[model samples]
Target chain A: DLVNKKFPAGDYKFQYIAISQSDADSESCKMPQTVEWSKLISENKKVIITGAPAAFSPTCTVSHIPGYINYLDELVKEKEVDQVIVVTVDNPFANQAWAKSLGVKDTTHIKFASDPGCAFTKSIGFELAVGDGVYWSGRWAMVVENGIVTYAAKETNPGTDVTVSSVESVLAHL
Target chain B: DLVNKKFPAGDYKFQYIAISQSDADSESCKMPQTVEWSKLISENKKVIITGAPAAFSPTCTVSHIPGYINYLDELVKEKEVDQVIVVTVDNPFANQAWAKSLGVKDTTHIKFASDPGCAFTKSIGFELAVGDGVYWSGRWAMVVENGIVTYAAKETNPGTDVTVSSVESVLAHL
Candidate 1:
């Protein structure tokens, strides 16, 4: 089970790049904003972090990530979630487009980040070997309180399965 | 015009990896298929190649690459095309997932490859410097015949322009 081998309920200074501008392939480029994972959790007593396969993979795009966007109110209000972050094994540009497509941009409590090299994924033991000499994170979710893992859930089937990491499931646990 | 940078219209080797399976994080893994771009054109007189910004970016997902997928038949017929390949600055996994989403698979004439690093992108002067120490190939299309770049059309505006690299535009040239 992916949940069983998580970060072991502790504080961590996780680093990631936040995508705020999203467009860098221009004659003149504007870079996305970068944010640290620790900074997010440090500010909020409880934070929600999710690992997605890629920016637009089927299960993730169709529901997994959107579920979090659609149910943000539930996560924040019902579960008292202070912050939410979705990390994908992609460049910041893609995440920005995806976030914009899902209308999940610039929420004080929600954020999307780029983990192009699987830094966070591998650090937490969620890295799965993708074909072509590449790796991506699995479908998983975690609730961190005071920089410690208070709750965790991960899909056994990884990329395709979205059930355990669903917003409903996480909310139920909270 | 992108066509100005023809691939030298003769025999030469161009390397790329074919994408069949799309997973990066697995306990056991099968590598994404590797391929040679020039070989495809060697067997036939002509080939189609397109470089996308990244897999699942708005323009490429919604229309750019989709247009090629939707009109493969025309490309083959009108251009006397032998093979069509879409390359992206992503892992094979992402390209495989994208091809699956568009229902493009398992045809000798149609293939997808990942250029995880900018090897191919930089080779052709197509790389656009994205932020965070990343570069992605801009939206561009090319037609090669007898190993030479016969026709090429890149978006002057890069990410947003589809007209120059559109199926309709390529067809007009053919």
Candidate 2:
């Protein structure tokens, strides 16, 4: 999470969002099918996003979630970003331990919430193929502008296709 | 994966078996779930018990997976053990990295598989939800004689619940 992150040169505007899997219980995890982007973000305006899972996942650890982790300090120190969040489907126990391990547990600005069981993920359409084997969610990232879904990113692969770097590149475009 | 295990106590028997999260994902995971006790002495005669994740979750880093670097050799040197495996929900590629990290990747006797989900833990009735959000298996130890389960040690609250030391204590009772 970042607070008052100010970009050194580029003016960042929240535009699109995306989602993927995190606490998935199945190999056939599918994209969440319950979200409607148009209704959330009327057009495009401001900032903020949430991410999940251990950073090791090909997507989250490597790219998607890290998109924000990597830039959190700079966003606040230089870019003046107002807000950012990295969420996870990991339970509170795992989440607390993970956040503490990452040295982000005490960040006064970045708000990392543990969406254990993917309830938040499910509420936002980050769902998995429920009955396929295990119950989980799809990976997704959403950009709320002044509290609207200005942008969203949704992965359709077997949940392994989302990434942190990808989300980073996307934010630049916004 | 004990290569030449011996129970100088000689007559050993168990009636249940369990595997870790990753091993449950292995093609060979379910074979022992419903195994009969008599089968051990008749067919395989060795009781094997494995875990989906390491005792502590440190089996996935540096040299390889980056987690199990601390518990490597001692696990393989368990002479009293007939079989031992460590599995993970992490993908096969990550699994390889984990094994390589522990330097146990090539140990034929110590079999590591995949549980992707908690299949084996759930299948053997070891899954327990004692706390509000904590989910883990009931530490269970199995004794197989001729490929059948004869004895099992189910962990309650103590973490030193099941292991070579605990099994030895149980063996003393027999």
| lDDT of candidate 2 over A40-143, digit per residue (tens) | 22332344555543423455554456556666776556544555655554333333334443445333345554443444455556555533254444565655
**lDDT (C-alpha) at residue A27 in model 1:** 36
Q: What is the lDDT of residue A11 in candidate 1?
A: 30
Per-residue lDDT value at B163 in model 1:
81
**What local distance difference test score does each model get?**
0.68, 0.41
Tens digits of lDDT, candidate 1, A22-118: 3323233334566655556566888888888767565788868888998898888977888888877776656665677777645467777766566
True C-alpha contacts between chains kept, each model in order: 0.15, 0.03
User: Which 10 successive residues of model 1 chain A have the least lDDT summed?
Assistant: A9-18
Provide the DockQ value for model 2: 0.08
**TM-scores of all candidate predictions against the true structure:** 0.61, 0.53
By TM-score, how accurate is candidate 1? Answer: 0.61
Q: Over all chains combined, what TM-score does candidate 2 have?
A: 0.53
